[PDB]
Amino acid sequence: MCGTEGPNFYVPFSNKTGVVRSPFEAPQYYLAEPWQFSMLAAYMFLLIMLGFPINFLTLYVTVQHKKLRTPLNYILLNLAVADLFMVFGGFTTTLYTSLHGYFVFGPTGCNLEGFFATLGGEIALWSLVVLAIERYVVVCKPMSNFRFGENHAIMGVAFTWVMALACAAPPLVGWSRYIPEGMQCSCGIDYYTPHEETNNESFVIYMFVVHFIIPLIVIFFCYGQLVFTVKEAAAQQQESATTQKAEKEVTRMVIIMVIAFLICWLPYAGVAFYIFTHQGSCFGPIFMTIPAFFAKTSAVYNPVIYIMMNKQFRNCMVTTLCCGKN
Numbered sequence: 431m432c433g434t435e436g437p438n439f440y441v442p443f444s445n446k447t448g449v450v451r452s453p454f455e456a457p458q459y460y461l462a463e464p465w466q467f468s469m470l471a472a473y474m475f476l477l478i479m480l481g482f483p484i485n486f487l488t489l490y491v492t493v494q495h496k497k498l499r500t501p502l503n504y505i506l507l508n509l510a511v512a513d514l515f516m517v518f519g520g521f522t523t524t525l526y527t528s529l530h531g532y533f534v535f536g537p538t539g540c541n542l543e544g545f546f547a548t549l550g551g552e553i554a555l556w557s558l559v560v561l562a563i564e565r566y567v568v569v570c571k572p573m574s575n576f577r578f579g580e581n582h583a584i585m586g587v588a589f590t591w592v593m594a595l596a597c598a599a600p601p602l603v604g605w606s607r608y609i610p611e612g613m614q615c616s617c618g619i620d621y622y623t624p625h626e627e628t629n630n631e632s633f634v635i636y637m638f639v640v641h642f643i644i645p646l647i648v649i650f651f652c653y654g655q656l657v658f659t660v661k662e663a664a665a666q667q668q669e670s671a672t673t674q675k676a677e678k679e680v681t682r683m684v685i686i687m688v689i690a691f692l693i694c695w696l697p698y699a700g701v702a703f704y705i706f707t708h709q710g711s712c713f714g715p716i717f718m719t720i721p722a723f724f725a726k727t728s729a730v731y732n733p734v735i736y737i738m739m740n741k742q743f744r745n746c747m748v749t750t751l752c753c754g755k756n
């Protein structure tokens with residue numbers, strides 16, 4: 431008997447003591463000490479203080495510099511919006527609920543936070559995928575007579591919205607469900623409960639295949655062929671020191687991006703491999719949600735990697751932060 435079941439929630443704590451309470455009604459201080467909820471609050475505060483400026487500044491600097499408004503950069507703006515969904519839909523709400531020690535907005539707010547937090551994270555996920563596909567098309571030139579235009583970049587953005595809705599919306603209609611997860615202060619997809627009435631098992635498989643395996647294969651294929659194409663072309667121009675420098679930094683950046691993607695991706699795979707095997711034992715509120723606890727940080731380091739390290743964005747932000755000088 432691992433936890434306590436109830437309508438619209440699963441508390442990862444046995445009720446044999448009788449101390450369990452609804453995560454919508456009363457604080458869950460048997461799951462964790464109050465200071466650990468405070469540390470959860472401090473972590474959300476860290477993510478808000480670092481996440482909102484970086485992502486809002488990305489939207490703001492784009493308004494001040496014409497050179498940034500390239501179609502290849504539209505997907506990076508879509509990434510910055512998605513992170514803001516995570517920052518205001520998820521991190522802000524969770525900071526507030528954390529300090530109460532339970533999800534005070536009830537099951538209705540659970541679907542709101544769940545949707546928008548899941549939507550924001552999903553849009554970011556597919557934006558990284560779409561950027562990889564866009565860069566692969568532009569460099570490797572797989573189509574004979576193709577030019578990447580404004581119309582094409584818009585489809586890529588809309589495509590993320592469709593994919594993110596494909597994951598964040600079914601839990602509201604009847605396929606899986608949103609419940610308080612971990613310490614019960616935030617809400618998300620329910621892969622902790624084999625809820626037959628919403629076919630949780632089929633949604634977890636669909637999530638694992640479409641939104642967890644496909645994004646990885648695409649990112650690895652696109653960036654692989656790109657580094658292959660770039661290293662192939664540079665080999666024909668070894669007389670050019672700059673071409674070799676460009677090839678080196680492109681390879682280094684692709685590695686950083688792919689490593690970063692794996693840092694958010696592998697925890698969910700290690701924890702799941704601890705569900706395919708080692709399935710019997712109960713999982714504390716921390717363990718099932720260790721991957722989530724660190725995947726939230728993507729709202730900070732993804733704009734650092736994909737935007738802050740972009741050569742044009744960087745100088746423009748310095749100019750904007752410095753009131754036009756330097």
Ligand SMILES: *[C@@H]1O[C@H](CO)[C@@H](O[C@@H]2O[C@H](CO)[C@@H](O[C@@H]3O[C@H](CO[C@H]4O[C@H](CO)[C@@H](O)[C@H](O)[C@@H]4O)[C@@H](O)[C@H](O[C@H]4O[C@H](CO)[C@@H](O)[C@H](O)[C@@H]4O)[C@@H]3O)[C@H](O)[C@H]2NC(C)=O)[C@H](O)[C@H]1NC(C)=O
Pocket residue numbers: 434435436445447448449450451452
């Ligand atoms: C996890 O485990 C705990 C412990 O079992 C559960 O908490 C119990 O929840 C039940 C509700 O299902 C509570 O029972 C109800 O208590 C009400 C309040 O009683 C208090 O006040 C009276 C004086 O009025 C005291 O004598 C008593 O000791 C209590 O302190 C009662 O009003 C309810 O009675 C009504 O319903 C019953 C049917 O259950 C009828 O027979 C009555 O006539 C009346 O209509 C009822 O007795 C119980 O008090 C809770 N216990 C504790 C320790 O909190 C969790 O709900 C459980 N599940 C989770 C968390 O999901």
Ligand SMILES: CC(C)[C@H](C(=O)N1CCC2(CC1)Oc1ccccc1O2)c1ccccc1
Pocket residue numbers: 548551552555619621634637638641642694695698699702725
């Ligand atoms: C963006 C999130 C909404 C998105 C997610 O929250 N998840 C992935 C699928 C999910 C549930 C959680 O389903 C799985 C099945 C087996 C192993 C791991 C699994 O993760 C996600 C997080 C990190 C990386 C990619 C996507």
Ligand SMILES: CCCCCCCCO[C@@H]1O[C@H](CO)[C@@H](O)[C@H](O)[C@H]1O
Pocket residue numbers: 457525526529530531532
């Ligand atoms: C931006 C930060 C706002 C924090 C608002 C937190 C308000 C917490 O409010 C407290 O919640 C407790 C339950 O945990 C109650 O028992 C207390 O009576 C109540 O004061």
Ligand SMILES: CCCCCCCCO[C@@H]1O[C@H](CO)[C@@H](O)[C@H](O)[C@H]1O
Pocket residue numbers: 520544547548550551552554555558611616617618619690691694721722725726728
């Ligand atoms: C590199 C990938 C970028 C996207 C990472 C998004 C991480 C989102 O993390 C997810 O948040 C959801 C809502 O809080 C929860 O339901 C999930 O448990 C959690 O894994």
Ligand SMILES: CCCCCCCCO[C@@H]1O[C@H](CO)[C@@H](O)[C@H](O)[C@H]1O
Pocket residue numbers: 649650651653654655657681684685688
């Ligand atoms: C998902 C795709 C990631 C592509 C990462 C490719 C990393 C290649 O890395 C390169 O491999 C060469 C092999 O000859 C070495 O000689 C180079 O020193 C090294 O930079």
Ligand SMILES: CCCCCCCCO[C@@H]1O[C@H](CO)[C@@H](O)[C@H](O)[C@H]1O
Pocket residue numbers: 470524610611612613614615616617715716717719720721722723724
């Ligand atoms: C050392 C840090 C370990 C942290 C493991 C996860 C602890 C609890 O898990 C967290 O609970 C929160 C409250 O519901 C959720 O909002 C977070 O998504 C979840 O990661």
Ligand SMILES: *C(=O)CCCCCCCCCCCCCCC
Pocket residue numbers: 748749751752753756
């Ligand atoms: C020019 O490029 C920049 C103009 C001068 C800015 C100097 C001030 C930067 C302060 C950033 C660090 C603030 C830390 C606050 C911590 C809460």
